[PDB]
Ligand binder design. Structure first.
Ligand code: A1BPH
Ligand code: ZN
Length: 139
């Protein structure tokens, strides 16, 4: 679990969005596993606008942060789950690092701010849904 809070927006994994997120829907994209909802309170986070490929992510299944080298956002095949059929997920970045079911929503950050959130994983890999291209989050 986990979310990004920036301005009057809450960014969460689409498959973990609540009834309240859907009732205050701003934008969603099943192909990216992202959903953005509106909030009444101003948010705590800053979004990176960069092309960093190194950063640090929070891993809830270890209660620890880990450094990672990650691939550029791309179209990656993701196996079927209870949430989605087998499909290509877009804007996804992979890295070697621990992740297990329950770790989605952990933040990945570089020196410029928030880069994205955990969205996939398995076998010593962790995948992050990029948010750096969503320029409208800042206005
Ligand atoms: N961290 C983590 C998740 C994880 C880690 C390790 C093993 C398995 C998983 C679960 C998994 O990859 N997904 C289930 C939920 C929806 C995700 C998607 N974006 O399509 C895919
Ligand atoms: Zn950066």
């Amino acid at each position: 679990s986990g979310a990004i809070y920036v301005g009057n927006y809450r960014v969460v994994n689409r498959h973990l969005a609540t009834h309240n997120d859907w009732a205050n829907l701003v934008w969603e994209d099943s192909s990216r596993d992202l959903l953005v909802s509106s909030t009444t309170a101003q948010g705590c986070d800053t979004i990176a606008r960069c092309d960093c490929q190194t950063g640090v992510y929070y891993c809830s299944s270890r209660r620890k942060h880990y450094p990672v080298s990650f691939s550029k956002p791309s179209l990656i095949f993701v196996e079927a789950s209870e949430y989605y059929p087998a499909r290509y997920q877009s804007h996804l970045m992979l890295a070697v690092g621990h992740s297990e079911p329950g770790d989605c929503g952990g933040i990945l950050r570089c020196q410029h701010g928030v880069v994205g959130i955990v969205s996939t994983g398995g076998n010593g890999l962790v995948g992050f849904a990029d948010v750096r291209d969503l320029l409208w989050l800042d206005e």
